Every structure is written in C-alpha cells, then in structure tokens.
Amino acid sequence: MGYFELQLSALRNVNGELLSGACCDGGCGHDECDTYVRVCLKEYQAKVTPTGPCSYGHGATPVLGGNSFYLPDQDPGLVVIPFQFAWPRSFTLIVEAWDWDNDTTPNEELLIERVSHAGMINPEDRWKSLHFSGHVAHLELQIRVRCDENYYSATCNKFCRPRNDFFGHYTCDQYGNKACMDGWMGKECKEAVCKQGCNLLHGGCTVPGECRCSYGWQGRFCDECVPYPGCVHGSCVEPWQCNCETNWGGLLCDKDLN
Ligand SMILES: *[C@H]1O[C@H](CO)[C@@H](O)[C@H](O)[C@H]1NC(C)=O
Ligand SMILES: [Ca+2]
Ligand SMILES: [Ca+2]
Ligand SMILES: [Ca+2]
C-alpha cells in the first residue's frame, strides 16, 4: 500500500496553441488556454504509446493558469495516485495538458501537449526531476513513490505495525523487520525467554523470566526430578523412582535390611 506523487512546477505554451494546431479559445489572441493536467500511470513500455488504459491509476489537477506559470491545506499542483498492489518499480508515466472550455461535452480535440517517460523508481529515492519538451509545451515536474505508514520495502508491500499485546511483543526497524522486545523471541515475537538455567526439556514459561516444570519435575531450573511419593532412604534420577540406599529396602526404601 502506497501512493505515487507528481509535483508540477512549470509549463510554457508561448503561442497559446493546442497540439492540433488551433488556438485554445498576430498571435493566438488574449483568451488564454485554461490549462489543467492529467496523469496516466500504466505498465512499462519499450515503445511508449499514447493509447492504452491507465492500469496503475490516474489523476488530474484543477485548472492552474493560463499559458505559462510556476507553482506555488490542499495543493492543486500535486497529483497523488494511491495504489494497493505491489509497486512494480518499472512504469510508464503519461502526462497531458488540456484546455478547459465550459462544456459538459468530452471534446478530445482540446489537448495541449502529451509527454511520456518510461523508467524505474523506488520508494527509497526522493524527488526525481523530469524535464520534457514537446512540439508545443515545456514541462518541469518531480515524481516520488512513498509507502503508507507501517509499509516498507521496494514494493511498499512489507507490513509491520508495532505491537505489545496478546499476539506479540516487538517494534519495527528501518526496513520493516520485527524487533522483539526485551524478553521475547520467535519469528512473531510471541514466545517468551524463560529464566536462565531453566532446562527447557522439562520447563516452560508464559512470561519472561519464568520457568514452571513439566509433570514429574521440580526445582528452580526444573532440573530436579520428583521422587515416588513417600520415598524415605531413596533418591530419584528419572521421575517417580525410589532407588534405595544400601541396606534399605521396600517400595519406599523404608525397610531396614540389616
Ligand atoms: C460557462 O461559463 C460560466 C461559468 O464559468 C457560466 O456562468 C456560463 O453560463 C457558462 N457558459 C456557457 C455554458 O456557455
Ligand atoms: Ca478552447
Ligand atoms: Ca480561456
Ligand atoms: Ca478554454
């Protein structure tokens, strides 16, 4: 999840001319072109065609000026095209200028200039400056790709939101990697580091620094086994044993054999 930004900085149509060779509204007069800009974003093309759908998204500006201008809480000279898919890095950018004419009709003949640029851009880079010269107009503009908050990587598809609750305990680093908080481990940082010395063959923990023993083991580090209940002069090696000392017998090692 991310967005593509284009910042228009300059545009010149000295003659007040459209691409078809007519005046917008001796020179071309004084009723100037009422200029606005469209941005088409589509797949990368070896040969860039004017036709084709904007399969990556599109945008437009309001009318910004007459024949020539620079720019300069909503910026009219900035086109933002959000996207959900993974950013493919390579792309075709088509930028068109238009005269608006106060007519509910879609008159295509009102096109001023069309420029294009096939290339590669990553979110890591910042504003790339692009200069264009057509038969009519000269454009100057910057472009940028940014990931939304908690999205990372060159595709803007790697997700990481910090979390400290029922499902995990971690922050995020520069590149979207989970950094487990003090006392947690595992790929999703939901697995706790038990206190040190805890034999984890027979121990476990829900909370960092804890170690409770499996059935049949005991002790602080859960490294000591549980003798058969009632065992007197006997000891344990594996749980539930009662191995007698010398001259002692019985199930509980309580019978004097001397
Ligand atoms: C369009 O121009 C103005 C708005 O800019 C409007 O008042 C006028 O009626 C319109 N003219 C037409 C449709 O010829
Ligand atoms: Ca016109
Ligand atoms: Ca005009
Ligand atoms: Ca016009």
Residue numbers in the entry: 27 to 51, 60 to 106, 124 to 309
List sentences quoted exactly from the publication behind this structure:
The Notch signalling pathway is conserved across all metazoan species and plays key roles in many aspects of cell biology including cell‐fate determination, stem cell maintenance, immune system activation and angiogenesis in humans (Guruharsha et al, 2012; Bray, 2016). Aberrant Notch signalling results in a number of inherited and acquired disorders, including various cancers, and it is therefore a key target for therapeutic intervention (Hansson et al, 2004; Groth & Fortini, 2012). Both the Notch receptors and the ligands are single‐pass type I transmembrane proteins, and direct protein–protein contact between adjacent cells initiates an intracellular signalling pathway. All of the Notch ligands have a modular extracellular architecture consisting of an N‐terminal C2 domain (formerly known as the MNNL domain), a Delta/Serrate/Lag‐2 (DSL) domain, and either 16 (Jagged1/Jagged2), 8 (Delta‐like1/Delta‐like4) or 7 (Delta‐like3) EGF repeats. Binding of a Notch ligand to EGF11‐12 of a Notch receptor results in a series of proteolytic cleavages, with the final intra‐membrane cleavage by gamma secretase, causing the release of the intracellular domain of Notch (NICD) from the plasma membrane.
Here, we present the first structures of Jagged2 (N‐EGF2 and N‐EGF3), which has only 58% sequence identity with human Jagged1 (N‐EGF3), together with the longest known structure of a Delta‐like4 ligand (human Delta‐like4 N‐EGF3). Two crystal forms of Jagged2 (N‐EGF2) (green) and one crystal form of Jagged2 (N‐EGF3) (dark green) were solved, including a total of seven crystallographically independent copies of N‐EGF2, and 1 copy of N‐EGF3 (N.b. not all of EGF3 is visible in the electron density). All of these copies have been superposed on each other by alignment of the DSL domain, showing some flexibility in the hinge region between the C2 and DSL domains, and further flexibility in the hinge regions between the EGF domains. The Jagged1 and Jagged2 C2 domains bind calcium ions (shown in red), whereas Delta‐like4 and Delta‐like1 do not; the aspartates involved in calcium binding are not conserved in Delta‐like4 and Delta‐like1. The C2 loops are ordered upon calcium binding in both Jagged1 (Chillakuri et al, 2013) and Jagged2 and contain the amino acid ligands for calcium binding although the number of calcium ions bound differs. Interestingly, the three calcium ions bound in the Jagged2 C2 domain are at equivalent positions to three of the five calcium ions bound in the Perforin C2 domain (Yagi et al, 2015). The α(1,6)‐linked fucose on the Asn‐153 N‐glycosylation site in Jagged2 packs against Trp‐151 side chain (shown).
